[PDB]
Design an enzyme around this catalytic site. Structure first.
Site, PDB file in Angstrom:
ATOM      1  N   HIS A 512       0.823  -1.197   0.000  1.00 29.44           N
ATOM      2  CA  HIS A 512       0.000   0.000   0.000  1.00 29.44           C
ATOM      3  C   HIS A 512       0.868   1.262   0.000  1.00 29.44           C
ATOM      4  O   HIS A 512       0.890   1.997  -0.984  1.00 29.44           O
ATOM      5  CB  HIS A 512      -0.922  -0.008   1.226  1.00 29.44           C
ATOM      6  CG  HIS A 512      -1.739   1.234   1.368  1.00 29.44           C
ATOM      7  ND1 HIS A 512      -1.871   1.904   2.560  1.00 29.44           N
ATOM      8  CD2 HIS A 512      -2.470   1.924   0.461  1.00 29.44           C
ATOM      9  CE1 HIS A 512      -2.657   2.949   2.384  1.00 29.44           C
ATOM     10  NE2 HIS A 512      -3.030   2.985   1.120  1.00 29.44           N
ATOM     11  N   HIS A 517       1.345   4.987  -3.013  1.00 30.43           N
ATOM     12  CA  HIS A 517       1.602   6.339  -2.489  1.00 30.43           C
ATOM     13  C   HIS A 517       3.018   6.912  -2.761  1.00 30.43           C
ATOM     14  O   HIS A 517       3.143   7.938  -3.462  1.00 30.43           O
ATOM     15  CB  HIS A 517       1.329   6.378  -0.980  1.00 30.43           C
ATOM     16  CG  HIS A 517      -0.122   6.228  -0.616  1.00 30.43           C
ATOM     17  ND1 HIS A 517      -0.903   7.297  -0.231  1.00 30.43           N
ATOM     18  CD2 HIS A 517      -0.930   5.138  -0.575  1.00 30.43           C
ATOM     19  CE1 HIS A 517      -2.130   6.871   0.033  1.00 30.43           C
ATOM     20  NE2 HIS A 517      -2.188   5.572  -0.203  1.00 30.43           N
ATOM     21  N   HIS A 703      -3.794   0.342  -6.582  1.00 30.53           N
ATOM     22  CA  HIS A 703      -4.161   0.996  -5.326  1.00 30.53           C
ATOM     23  C   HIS A 703      -5.587   0.617  -4.911  1.00 30.53           C
ATOM     24  O   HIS A 703      -5.783   0.346  -3.744  1.00 30.53           O
ATOM     25  CB  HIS A 703      -3.988   2.533  -5.337  1.00 30.53           C
ATOM     26  CG  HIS A 703      -4.421   3.194  -4.050  1.00 30.53           C
ATOM     27  ND1 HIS A 703      -5.658   3.781  -3.896  1.00 30.53           N
ATOM     28  CD2 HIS A 703      -3.797   3.327  -2.851  1.00 30.53           C
ATOM     29  CE1 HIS A 703      -5.746   4.306  -2.680  1.00 30.53           C
ATOM     30  NE2 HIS A 703      -4.637   4.027  -2.017  1.00 30.53           N
ATOM     31  N   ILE A 851      -7.076   8.611  -1.311  1.00 31.09           N
ATOM     32  CA  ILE A 851      -7.192   8.381   0.112  1.00 31.09           C
ATOM     33  C   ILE A 851      -6.186   7.285   0.495  1.00 31.09           C
ATOM     34  O   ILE A 851      -5.854   7.183   1.652  1.00 31.09           O
ATOM     35  CB  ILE A 851      -8.700   8.073   0.503  1.00 31.09           C
ATOM     36  CG1 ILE A 851      -8.916   7.971   2.022  1.00 31.09           C
ATOM     37  CG2 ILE A 851      -9.227   6.874  -0.233  1.00 31.09           C
ATOM     38  CD1 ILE A 851      -8.648   9.282   2.789  1.00 31.09           C
TER      39      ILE A 851
END
Ligand code: 4NC
Ligand code: FE
Length: 851
Positions: A512, A517, A703, A851
Site C-alpha cells: 500500500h 503512495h 491501489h 485516500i
C-alpha cells in the site's frame, strides 16, 4: 472588416463553497440545492467592480520580440443567473473583450484577482468572431491576490500541442510558466505557491523532542534508498541540520489540494482529526478505567458492531460533534461508539477461522499480490553471509504428505501445485530489535497446495526466530501442521495469526504505502515541472494524480511519522518506514506491470493461445483474472492515445518536454535507482506506452485492489491482526494450559490490544471509503479537457470497454464453479468493478490515489 466584441463567460467557485471550515453545516445532500446558481445571495456583487481582470493573449499575432499580443485588461461586468450547464457551487459572470481582426485568435489569457479572498477559477468560454468555433479554457485553479505573484496567472486554451506544434507567439509563454512551476530550489514554501520540487524523507522524526524520536533520512544514500517527496521549505531542526523541522501545516502546491462541496467528503481532515483529537481522548479512557483494557472473549469483539463500546459523556460529547466524523462514527447516545459490521462476518461470524478462507485471502483478500509458485524445494532465502540463506527453510518433504491428493513433493512441484507465502527476509534482520519491545514476532513461511477442486489449502507454517547464539548460524525454526480438533487446532490458529501479522504489516508498509503512495509521488512532480498543461501526455496522466500529494503530505504528518498511527499499530513498530526503504531496494518499475508481476512470481506462463497472452497456473485467482481485464483496457487506451500524437519514434526523441521529464524522473525523482539497467529509455513509442500504462495501473486499479478491502476484511481484528505480543505457548506450561482451557483469551492476548484495535479500525474505516465526489476510472474526467475529438472518441471507447468489463466481472461472481471468488465467508470479489456509489462499498476503482 470590423472591430468586434468577444463575448466571454467565466465560471468560478467561491472559497466558502469549497472550504472545510465553512462547509461544516452541509454534508448530507450535495449536487443539489438550486445548483448554487451563484446569483442568489449577493456576495457576487463584490466580484463586479474593479475586482477581477482578464487579459487575452493572441496565439497568431506577435509583437516585436515574438510574444503574443496582449489585449486590454478587462474587468468582470455582469452576473449570469443561469446556464444549462451551471453546476452546484458555481457562479457565472459575463465579460466582453474588445478585440479586432489584426489581433487574430486568442490562445491564452492572464488573470488578476484584486480581492483579498482567493476563489477557484473553473473555466472561460469565448464566443468568437471569424469562421471559428467557441474557444474553451479549462482552468480548475485557485487564484490568489495579484500582488502575491511576480507575474500574472496564465491559462491556455483547450488545444493540445506537442512542443514543435505550439503557435510561435505562445512558445515563450509556455516555457515561462514551466520555469515558474519549477522555482529555484530555495526558500520556505507558502500556501499560495505552485512550486514543484523534490526532497528526501528527512521529515518524519522529531529529534528536538529527543534522541528516541529521531528517524533515519530515507533517500539519498545506499542504505535506505527511497523515492523523493514534495519539497516544503521549512527550517532545519535545531539538533540535526539534516532533518527538517515539524509543522502542523504541510505545504503542497496549491492546486494539488482539492476541496469538496460536502462536509462528509473531507476525508483527510477526518484522518487528521482521529490522530489529533480522537486518539488522545480515547487514550484517556484506557489510562484509568471506563473501559476494560483487554478483550476477554470473541463475543466482546463482536459487541463492537452491535451495542459497541461504552464511553463516558466527557469523551463522547467531545467526539460526536467534530466536522467529518459524524459519518464514520456511529453513536447511540452517551455510552456507545459503534462500528459497522465488516463484510467478512455478515454472512458467517466464524468462517474466517477456516483454512480455506485463510488461503483464499492470498488470492482475493487485501494483499492478493505476494503468493509465488514454488520452483525448487526447500525454499531459499536471499539473505547474505548469515547461514539460513545459504541454507533453507526447515520444512521437509515428510511434513507435506497427508490426505487430499497423494503425490510426491517433486510431482507437485512439476505439476505447479505448490505455492509459497514468504515473509522471512524483510523482518529477519530487525527481529532481534523488534522482540526487545512489547512486540513478539516471528519470520514466517507458509506452503500451500492447490487442491483438485481448484481451491488452495495451507499445508505447513514455519515460525523462525533469529538467533540461538548470534546471526552466524541462522534461523531457529519450528514447523506447524494443520489440525482441526483439540489443543493442536488452537495452536494452528495461533500459527496462522503469526503469518497474518507479518502479512498485514508488509501489506500496509509495502503493498500500500511504498508501491502506490510513495512511488507515484515523484512522477507527479516530474510531470508538472516539465510537461506543459497543453502537452498530450500531461492530459493523459493528470486525472490519475488527483489529491495524491495531499494524502501523502498528511501521511508524513500523522501516519508514517515518529509515534504516529502506523508505528503504534503495526508489527514493525518504530522500524516501519526504514524497513520499507530496505524493500524498495528490490523495487523495479517494469515489474509493476501486471503480466510482468504475474510471470515473476511464477503465477503465469507466457502463452499466445490465451486471452491476454499469458496462461495462469491458478485459474481461479480473482485479483489476477479481474486485474488482467483492467490492465488490458488501460494499455489499449494509452496505446491509442499515444499513437494519435506521435508520428514516429523520432518525434518522441525530438520532444524536449517529454525527454526532460523522463530524465529528471530517473535521475532525481527515483534518483537512488538512476543507474538501474531496466529503466525504459524514452526512444520508442512502445516504451512510452508501457510506462504510462504502469503509472495509471499503479494509481488506479493496483491501489484500489490493495486499499478498499481493508475494512471489509480487516475490520474484524481477529481476521487481520496487526501485531503480536506473545510467543507460541510451550508444550507443558501455564500458557499452554490456558490455551487448553480458554483458547479465545489466549488468542486475544497474542494479537493487537483493545486500545490499538480501536485506533486501527477508526483509520481503516475512513481509508476504505469512497467520497461522494470520487472520480472513477474510465469514463470519468473532470469536464472537457481537450478539443481533439479523436482523443474524446478514444476516451469514450475506454469507458465503454470498462462498462463491458464491469458486467463480465459480475457474471463471474455468479459462477458457482469459481469458488475462490466468494469463499465460506460468502464475499463476492468486487474490488475491481470500476464503478461505485459512495461509502464502504467493497468496490470501485478511482482514477488516482485519493485516500
Ligand atoms: O500505508 N500508509 O502509510 C497509508 C495509510 C493510509 C493513508 O491514507 C496513506 O496515505 C498512507
Ligand atoms: Fe491509499
Amino acid at each position: 472588416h470590423r472591430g468586434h466584441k468577444i463575448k466571454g463567460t467565466v465560471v468560478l467557485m467561491r472559497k466558502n463553497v469549497l472550504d472545510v471550515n465553512s462547509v461544516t453545516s452541509v454534508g448530507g445532500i450535495i449536487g443539489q440545492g438550486l445548483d448554487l446558481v451563484g446569483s442568489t445571495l449577493d456576495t457576487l456583487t463584490a466580484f463586479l467592480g474593479r475586482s477581477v481582470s482578464l487579459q487575452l493573449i493572441s496565439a497568431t499575432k506577435a509583437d516585436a520580440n515574438g510574444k503574443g499580443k496582449l489585449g486590454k485588461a478587462t474587468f468582470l461586468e455582469g452576473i449570469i443567473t443561469s446556464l444549462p450547464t451551471l453546476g452546484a457551487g458555481q457562479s457565472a459572470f459575463k465579460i466582453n473583450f474588445e478585440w479586432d481582426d489584426g489581433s487574430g485568435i486568442p490562445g491564452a489569457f492572464y488573470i488578476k484577482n484584486f480581492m483579498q479572498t482567493e476563489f477557484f477559477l473553473v473555466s472561460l468560454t469565448l464566443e468568437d468572431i471569424p469562421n471559428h468555433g467557441s474557444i474553451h479554457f479549462v482552468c480548475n485553479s485557485w487564484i490568489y491576490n495579484a500582488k502575491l505573484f511576480k507575474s500574472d496567472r496564465i491559462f491556455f486554451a483547450n488545444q493540445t500541442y506537442l512542443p514543435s506544434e505550439t503557435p510561435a507567439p505562445l512558445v515563450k509563454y509556455r516555457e515561462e510558466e514551466l520555469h515558474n512551476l519549477r522555482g529555484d530550489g530555495t526558500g520556505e514554501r507558502k500556501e499560495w505557491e505552485r512550486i514543484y520540487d523534490y526532497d528526501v524523507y528527512n521529515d518524519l522524526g522529531d529529534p528536538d523532542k529527543g534522541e528516541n524520536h529521531a528517524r533515519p533520512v530515507l533517500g539519498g544514500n545506499d542504505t535506505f534508498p527511497y523515492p523523493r517527496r514534495g519539497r516544503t521549505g521549512r527550517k532545519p531542526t535545531r539538533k540535526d541540520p539534516n532533518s527538517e523541522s515539524r509543522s502542523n501545516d504541510v505545504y503542497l502546491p496549491r492546486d494539488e489540494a482539492f476541496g469538496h462541496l460536502k462536509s462528509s467528503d473531507f476525508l483527510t481532515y477526518g484522518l487528521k482529526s482521529v490522530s489529533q483529537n480522537v486518539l488522545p481522548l480515547l487514550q484517556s479512557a484506557f489510562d484509568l478505567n471506563f473501559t476494560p483494557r483487554e478483550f476477554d472473549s470473541f463475543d466482546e469483539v463482536h459487541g463492537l458492531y452491535s451495542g459497541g463500546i461504552k464511553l463516558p459523556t466527557d469523551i463522547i460529547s467531545k467526539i460526536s460533534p467534530l466536522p467529518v466524523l459524524k459519518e464514520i462514527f456511529r453513536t447511540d447516545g452517551e455510552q456507545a461508539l459503534k462500528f459497522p459490521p465488516p463484510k467478512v462476518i455478515q454472512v458467517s461470524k466464524s468462517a474466517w477461522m477456516t483454512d480455506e478462507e485463510f488461503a483464499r485471502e492470498m488470492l482475493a483478500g487485501v494483499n492478493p499480490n505476494l503468493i509465488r509458485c514454488l520452483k525448487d524445494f526447500p525454499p531459499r532465502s536471499k539473505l547474505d553471509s548469515q547461514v539460513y540463506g545459504d541454507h533453507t527453510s526447515q520444512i521437509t518433504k515428510e511434513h507435506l504428505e497427508p490426505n487430499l491428493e497423494g503425490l510426491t513433493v517433486d510431482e507437485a512441484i512439476q505439476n505447479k501445485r505448490l505455492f509459497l507465502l514468504d515473509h522471512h527476509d524483510p523482518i529477519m534482520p530487525y527481529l532481534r530489535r523488534i522482540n526487545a519491545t512489547s512486540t513478539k514476532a516471528y519470520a514466517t513461511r507458509t506452503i500451500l497446495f492447490l487442491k483438485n477442486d481448484g481451491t488452495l489449502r495451507p499445508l505447513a507454517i514455519e515460525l523462525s526466530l533469529p538467533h540461538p547464539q548470534g546471526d552466524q548460524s541462522g534461523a531457529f525454526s519450528q514447523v506447524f501442521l494443520p489440525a482441526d480438533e483439540g489443543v493442536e487446532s488452537s495452536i494452528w490458529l495461533l500459527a496462522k495469526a503469526y503469518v497474518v501479522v507479518n502479512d498485514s504489516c508488509y501489506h500496509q508498509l509495502v503493498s500500500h504505502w511504498l508501491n502506490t503512495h510513495a512511488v507515484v509521488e515523484p512522477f507527479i512532480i516530474a510531470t508538472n515541472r516539465h510537461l506543459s498543461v497543453v502537452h498530450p501526455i500531461y492530459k493523459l496522466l493528470h486525472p490519475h494524480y488527483r489529491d495524491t500529494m495531499n494524502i501523502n503530505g498528511l501521511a508524513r504528518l500523522s501516519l508514517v511519522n515518529d509515534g504516529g498511527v502506523i508505528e503504534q499499530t503495526f508489527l514493525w513498530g518504530r522500524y516501519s518506514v526504514e524497513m520499507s526503504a530496505v524493500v524498495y531496494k528490490d523495487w523495479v518499475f517494469t515489474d509493476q506491470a501486471l503480466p510482468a508481476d504475474l510471470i515473476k512470481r511464477g503465477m503465469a506462463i507466457e502463452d499466445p493461445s490465451c486471452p491476454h497472452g499469458i496462461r495462469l497456473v491458478i485459474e481461479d485467482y480473482p485479483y489476477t483474472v479481474d486485474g488482467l481485464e483492467i490492465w488490458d483496457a488501460i494499455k489499449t487506451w494509452v496505446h491509442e492515445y499515444v499513437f494519435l500524437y506521435y508520428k514516429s519514434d523520432d518525434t518522441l526523441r525530438e520532444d524536449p518536454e517529454l525527454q526532460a521529464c523522463w530524465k529528471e524522473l530517473v535521475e532525481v525523482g527515483h534518483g537512488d535507482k538512476k543507474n538501474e539497467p531496466w529503466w525504459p529509455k524514452m526512444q520508442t513509442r512502445e516504451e512510452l506506452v508501457e510506462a504510462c500504462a504502469i503509472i495509471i495501473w499503479t494509481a488506479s486499479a493496483l491501489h484500489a485492489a490493495v486499499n478498499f478491502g481493508q475494512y471489509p476484511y480487516g475490520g474484524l481484528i481477529l481476521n487481520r491482526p496487526t501485531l503480536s505480543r506473545r510467543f507460541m505457548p510451550e508444550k507443558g506450561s501455564a500458557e499452554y494450559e490456558e490455551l487448553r482451557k480458554n483458547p479465545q483469551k489466549a488468542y486475544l492476548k497474542t494479537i493487537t490490544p483493545k486500545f490499538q484495535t480501536l485506533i486501527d479500525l477508526s483509520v481503516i474505516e475512513i481509508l476504505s471509503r469512497h467520497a461522494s465526489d470520487e472520480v472513477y476510472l474510465g469514463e470519468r474526467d473532470n469536464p472537457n479537457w481537450t478539443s481533439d475529438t479523436r482523443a474524446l472518441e478514444a476516451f469514450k471507447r475506454f469507458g465503454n470497454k470498462l462498462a463491458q468489463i464491469e458486467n463480465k466481472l459480475s457474471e463471474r461472481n455468479n459462477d458457482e464453479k469459481l469458488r475462490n471468488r466468494c469463499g465460506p465467508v460468502q464475499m463476492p470479489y468486487t474490488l475491481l468493478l470500476p464503478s461505485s456509489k459512495e461509502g464502504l462499498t467493497f468496490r470501485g476503482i478511482p482514477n488516482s490515489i485519493s485516500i
